[PDB]
């Protein structure tokens, strides 16, 4: 009864898409809400444990750049309910409308994503699916990291997952599936590196390639890395160095989010101001 929402209180609206372990609709509950739901009569023990883990993780997230979890329901079907974000995912803005973002707003989007993952890692949370689609822009101004279905707390008995099609953000160790914990803070850092690649190039990585299945093998191998030569010229040099640092093939040389955040915060201060000062107005 902590964050549980009684049945009947949530008016579920139009189907908007799918999330990790359910389909997402728009809903009305003291305003707008998003609802990720599982369209099944009876959850299996595996879907119910997955849902329980996601609620447990979201109940520890309380940050401006994390999609605000608002409650959960069990009664009709299992459902996670969040704040509603008018707008689109950053994936939609970058590759589906080519919304012309200024380099300044691109820097700010990266900085807010870094703040969100700084918070997550400081609470020992690994997202394990950070991608441009799980980044939502509220009112095309604020970043909200969402979709915690594959997230976990860093624990000894961690996890056990349906990796599926979205694999571009997967780090080489996660592709190879050969070490102790393929998912880690460094796997999240590499996913972050790929999202900065998308922010600074405008396109997805490994875009101009001939074959598609081997691509994995090449990344797994170390044979293929993002083409950093497609970063646009107005992208600051510190930002390109930082993305290279987040994309380095061996986990242990990749930086941690406290210093990723500090680097994005400091380089963002060296870009020319877009506004002017304000002076005393007319009384």
């Amino acid at each position: 009864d902590d964050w549980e929402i009684p049945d009947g209180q949530i008016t579920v609206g139009q189907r908007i898409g799918s999330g990790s372990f359910g389909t997402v609709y728009k809903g009305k509950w003291h305003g707008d809400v998003a609802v990720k739901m599982l369209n099944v009569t009876a959850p299996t023990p595996q879907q119910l444990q997955a849902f329980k883990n996601e609620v447990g993780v979201l109940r520890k997230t309380r940050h401006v750049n994390i999609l605000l979890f608002m409650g959960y329901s069990t009664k009709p079907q299992l459902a996670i309910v969040t704040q509603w974000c008018e707008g689109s995912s950053l994936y939609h803005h970058l590759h589906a409308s080519e919304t012309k973002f200024e380099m300044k707003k691109l820097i700010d989007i990266a900085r807010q994503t870094a703040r969100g993952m700084d918070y997550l890692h400081a609470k020992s949370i690994i997202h394990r699916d950070l991608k441009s689609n799980n980044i939502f822009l509220h009112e095309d101004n604020t970043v909200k990291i969402g979709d915690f279905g594959l997230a976990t707390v860093k624990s000894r008995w961690s996890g056990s997952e349906q990796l599926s099609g979205s694999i571009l953000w997967m780090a080489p160790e996660v592709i190879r599936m050969q070490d102790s914990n393929p998912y880690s803070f460094q796997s999240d850092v590499y996913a972050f590196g790929i999202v900065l690649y998308e922010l600074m190039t405008g396109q997805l990585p490994y875009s101009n390639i001939n074959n598609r299945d081997q691509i994995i093998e090449m990344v797994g191998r170390g044979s293929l890395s993002p083409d950093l030569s497609k970063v646009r010229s107005n992208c600051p040099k510190r930002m390109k160095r930082l993305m290279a640092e987040c994309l380095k093939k061996k986990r242990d040389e990749r930086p941690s989010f406290p210093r990723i955040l500090a680097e994005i915060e400091e380089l963002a201060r060296e870009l020319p101001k877009i506004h002017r000062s304000a002076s005393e107005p007319s009384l």
């Binding site: 963002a268 201060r269 506004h275 000062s277 304000a278 002076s279 107005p281 007319s282 009384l283």
Partner: protein, 230 residues
């Protein structure tokens, strides 16, 4: 003719948003020679601030177009000549206000409140002349701006409490002078942060009207400090 008829037609020009008319009315009122009232002071200030602000905004737009026009040599010539037309208007407005200050307002300011208010207005209009002056007279104008600002600042700190809206506004505009004109962000943030921090201490002190007057400028100081440190 009457001073009060001029003040009333100034208010009516303010209501119709004909700021050139309000400015003319207030200029007539100040040329009569008597010390202005607080309302008359604020009407003159509002009038000329709108009159000159229209030109500052237009100047910025066409100046930006002027530098950002590369291929076309004839188009860039046209933007340059229109920028100079706007600039001439700008300068005339500022010279009008600075003449009013020097000849009537500054000499007739008995109280300290008035003399910091008018010296700060002198700093503001020389600062508007600094925003467009190029090369030769630039240094002279920048110096005159800083000098008026500096004298008003000293008198502010010696007879006005840190929360006084005129002193707070002087702090805001002088810090903007430092940032935008002298290009010295650090000194600008120093002046701004000091004034804001000194006001925040005593903010609990003030009445609810005084608090509205003071907070309106303190929010601008903190907005500036947020923008300058970001």
């Amino acid at each position: 003719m009457d001073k009060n008829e001029l003040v009333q037609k100034a208010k009516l020009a303010e209501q119709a948003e004909r700021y050139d008319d309000m400015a003319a009315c207030m200029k007539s009122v100040t040329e009569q020679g008597a010390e202005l009232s607080n309302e008359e002071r604020n009407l003159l200030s509002v009038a000329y601030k709108n009159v000159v602000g229209a030109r500052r905004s237009s100047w910025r737009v066409v100046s930006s177009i002027e530098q950002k026009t590369e291929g076309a040599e004839k188009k860039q010539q046209m933007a340059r000549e229109y920028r100079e037309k706007i600039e001439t208007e700008l300068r005339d407005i500022c010279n009008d206000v600075l003449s009013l200050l020097e000849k009537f307002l500054i000499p007739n300011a008995s109280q300290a409140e008035s003399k910091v208010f008018y010296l700060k207005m002198k700093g503001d209009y020389y600062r508007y002349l600094a925003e467009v002056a190029a090369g030769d007279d630039k240094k002279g104008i920048v110096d005159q701006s800083q000098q008026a600002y500096q004298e008003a600042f000293e008198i502010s700190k010696k007879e006005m409490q840190p929360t006084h809206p005129i002193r707070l506004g002087l702090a805001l505009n002088f810090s903007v002078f430092y940032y935008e004109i002298l290009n010295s962000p650090e000194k600008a943030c120093s002046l701004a942060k000091t004034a804001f921090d000194e006001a925040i201490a005593e903010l609990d002190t003030l009445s609810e009207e005084s608090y509205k007057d003071s907070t309106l400028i303190m929010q601008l100081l903190r907005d500036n400090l947020t923008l300058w440190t970001s």
